[PDB]
């Protein structure tokens, strides 16, 4: 409830084109992660990727990179520890690896 | 030619190659963790250490202050010469000649012909994509081992305070309101006795990787892109450099710092041809790998030549008594 | 040109360097940790010493005393009069002079041939992003290693309370030993802004003095001479009170016109005869090394001139230039 | 002006309100002993009450402060954002001229107004009262000395010493000439208290000059005589004029000196050199 | 629960405005695979405090939040009680996550 | 949990409307690789207890709260059998930890 | 450890509702990296000892047990014949701090 659409959007601007900063790594360490560890970092490598967005989307006219809401993390939060089940918790994993890859209204 | 030094040096009193401490006044000194045998256990201690990155700054810093003084200093970036590390780093599709011209990043051999720096250190062009490794090659600074089993590990660190003094021509200090200027930050202090070690893979020097050799009648033979007498003094330079790193250039804050600097003792190899890495000095049986490389290295066909200050080194194996750094410089430089 | 000067000086009760822990009233003198030879194997003990920021701050305090006294020593920041070091501050954009009008720091030129300060001893401007090294390397102030190993510790450190409602009792470190010191100054380079050291006018490197020649001259004679305090009683804090005893027990100076390596210091058990082979390699490198001698022994085919002190090799010197 | 003093007493049976260390010299030992000296502080406070004595005497010497008057240098203490001046016009610490104008204690031997920020460095410099090594060498007494006068900051605030009007380097004096002169000449004179009832004078040496010049090696060693004819030949082949006095002892040769055969010969010497 | 307060201050160090940014503490908390320079951050963090107090009541911000000091000894407890590097690891990477996300400390 | 007081008298000591300010006590209680420099640092704390106690009077404050007996005596109990600095310096730094908090700053 | 007795002996020598407010003899005591000076501090201390009881009686509260002379006794023979100066020096230092805690000492 509204982490999709964040989340979403966040990691396409990590992913989309118009930027040359085509990191997969991080895409591939949020997917394939069967313990809850490997996916928090995951998320957290790719939220740290921030500044970089920000300085090109500043540089090249894009428009500002949002940030997902701190509501989203609290969800985000509470759904993996409340989820110990390594099955629902793969799930979200790949829901989010898929959200990583989206055509969201990118540079005009 | 590919000369290695190594040995047993020791820092006394050097705030060298802090680490800032990530925006605090009490100032973090760089902290490395080693491993110690400790007889029966192994230990592992975190020391004040001096980074190889910083090292082979330094080593740059000496070799264009030397490189200067030979009549062929064109070729050295003017932005070597005001000790900047920085080489194509953001953007930057072009480089700056000493000179004020314009010099491209395509066909590195011209890049390493009209840069000193290309030529030594090596590059890293990120717009042209374009990669030299650095023929100089510096090894950690670290406490050696008999020292940390002596003290029983110990801590190396005092942590002096140092402050400012503000007149603003009023006579006091001043409050938040105007400014105050007056900073009090606490730098760790340290000591010890370290293990310097740096590698000069000078056998590359105005050979570029992307044609290191030539094959006109089916021999290997360097690619020499500059004149002889271009690269001599390049190789004199180079090995000039080593000079301040033993009398003591090297250590952040050298202004306020300049620590006591002198090497117990040191082991210096010329080794035209390639050869294994010599050994850092941080350990105590490294005396024997040293005597068995340097003894059967020459049934290899090695015509290694071995400079040996402060150790016996037995009676066998012969070696060249010496006191001093540039007096190695010379006898390096009077044959080649 | 490039001159460093090592010296043996025995000290005796100095309160310098001394902050204590807080407020309380106590104050420890900086004893640092350094290490031995002896002969059960390299050990470290907490001596007191004198920092590098002291000796390179009581340099600035020697070269503003004796550059005011130069005709050119008009071009010297306010903060060098008031005996103030700190340069350009937290949030420091523009600058401070001697006459009053203040200059823009919009490169280092400006900053070069107005504030002999900036380019004696460096400076650092948070805001504009201006950084230079200061040319004055500072070395510290330690016990000899014989001496620690030879007098048995014992902290070399003891303490002495002093009195003064308004009435408070406090006590204060006090030192001794033979203490060294290698300063280093590196001045081939003043009048020259890093950003542009070398022009390269016509192909043929040559220094970028933007100022008059008699301007640098003057500068390096007051930086030189400020090397006479250093061996006088202006070394170190509370000078109002303690005024430590110097007497210069040994002193070398090797002084050149071109880039040239440190020396190794005394504060080891075997250091003159190292001294002896680095001086005299260095001269038959092809450095033209001027050495001078004060209380030490030398040996054979090197020079060894019993000096006064150093203000008459700096005359002479700045003579034959 | 600048003058240093270096000389050696004998002190018999010393009574005070402390303990230091000396080192053996030579060879055969550089170990520390306690000896029962006199600490530099002391010597500073000698110098205060003697320079408040003599100056409290002059017509021109009603700047004081009252603390002054009895012997109480606390300079500013807890709890004392303001002084009280001698005549009784308790003056406001504001700035550092006003202080310079208002007071001459606070600005021969410094100030620290913790409250205010307000600060001084100290113009005269206190040295230890130290054993000479023979006597320590020979007895396991002979008592060295020293001091230093840095008169040609009075009266100079510490913020700024030249106004710079037309591009010249003259000296910023905040108080009349006729009071920097009194001053001058009560420093001077305020040497007689620590040269002066059971110890008596044995050697003393000093240099005086205008300019900033070397102080001179303490009267603590045994072959100091070649340290203080390396100072006095460096000094006179430097350039600037200096003016060297001796008290029973034989400096050197070829070079001029004054030989005082008085304290007060000594004082008058340097009241008439500035 | 007990991560908002940290992990707000967390963010603290590195948002909108805010003209200091420490991202080597940051990294610290978050990859903790030992015991330790995972308090060792945070206490940088915490050293770095009156830093960000006196830019936020300087240039544009209101005050900063300190963290509760019973969210710290939450923490202490949470950590203590932990053996395995997982827990360990999960707990530095939740706690290093919030330092960025969209906050609007300055208006 | 048994350490409030040692916590609240840190904080007191580093936290503002105290008008001492001292880092560099907290800096060398932090980074303590041996146990030396964590002694010296905890000494140095506890110096300042005196003027904590006095000064408190000179506004208007409430009383810091002085370590217990029975805290030093457990942190002194725990702290002898220390050989492997990890658990040291995780110790010191705790201490550090505890020592910048938000409590009630002087009410 | 024993050291709760002499850190309490030496707590009431600094501790409120006393005049004796010499605070060097704890500074003297920890930074004491060899013998002599440690030995020469304890002995000052042990002789300020009559003032500390005189004062107690005068007060009304009790005044510190008589100076036993085991304690002190092991304290040497645990200080000098430990050649290296870490643990002479923590203890020394442990036993200094060991008096600046506050609780009902004279009610």
Not at chain 2, 176 to 187: D, I, N, P, V, W
């Amino acid at each position: 409830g509204g982490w999709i659409r964040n989340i979403g959007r966040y990691l396409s601007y990590l992913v989309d084109d118009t930027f040359e900063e085509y990191a997969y790594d991080v895409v591939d360490g949020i997917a394939k992660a069967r313990t809850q560890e490997e996916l928090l970092e995951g998320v957290y490598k790719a939220l740290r990727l921030a500044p970089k967005l920000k300085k090109k989307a500043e540089s090249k006219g894009c428009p500002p990179p949002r940030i997902p809401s701190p509501e989203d993390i609290e969800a985000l939060e509470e759904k993996v520890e409340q989820l110990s089940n390594p099955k629902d918790l793969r799930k979200l994993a790949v829901s989010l690896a898929l959200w990583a890859f989206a055509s969201w209204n990118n540079c005009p | 030619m590919y000369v290695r030094i190594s040995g047993r040096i020791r820092l006394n009193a050097h705030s060298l190659n802090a680490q800032g401490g990530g925006g605090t006044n009490y100032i973090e000194i760089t902290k490395t963790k080693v491993t110690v045998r400790t007889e029966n256990g192994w230990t592992v201690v975190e020391v004040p250490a001096i980074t190889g990155n910083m090292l082979k700054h330094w080593h740059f810093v000496g070799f264009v202050d030397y490189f200067k003084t030979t009549p062929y200093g064109v070729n050295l970036t003017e932005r070597a010469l005001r000790y900047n590390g920085t080489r194509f780093g953001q953007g930057e599709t072009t480089a700056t000649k000493a000179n004020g011209a314009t010099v491209q990043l395509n066909d590195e051999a011209t890049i390493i012909k009209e840069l000193a720096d290309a030529d030594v250190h090596g590059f890293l062009a990120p717009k042209t994509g374009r990669r030299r490794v650095s023929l100089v090659k510096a090894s950690f600074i670290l406490p050696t081992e008999d020292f940390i089993k002596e003290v029983e590990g110990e801590r190396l660190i005092t942590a002096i305070k140092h402050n400012r003094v503000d007149v603003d021509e009023k006579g006091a200090i001043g409050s938040s309101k105007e400014g105050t200027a007056q900073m009090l930050f606490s730098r760790e202090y340290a000591t010890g006795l370290y293990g310097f070690s740096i590698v000069l893979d000078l056998g590359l020097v105005g050979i570029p990787q992307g044609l290191p050799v030539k094959f006109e009648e089916n021999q290997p033979r360097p690619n020499i892109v500059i004149d002889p007498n271009e690269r001599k003094a390049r190789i004199e330079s180079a090995l000039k450099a080593l000079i301040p790193m033993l009398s003591g250039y090297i250590g952040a804050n050298l202004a306020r710092s300049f620590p006591v600097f002198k090497v117990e003792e040191l082991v210096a190899i010329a080794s035209e041809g390639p050869i294994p890495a010599l050994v850092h000095g941080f350990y105590e049986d490294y005396i024997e790998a040293n005597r068995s490389i340097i003894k059967n290295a020459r049934a290899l066909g090695f015509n290694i030549e071995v400079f040996t200050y402060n150790v016996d080194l037995g009676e066998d194996i012969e070696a060249t008594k010496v006191s001093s750094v540039e007096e190695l410089v010379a006898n390096l430089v009077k044959m080649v």
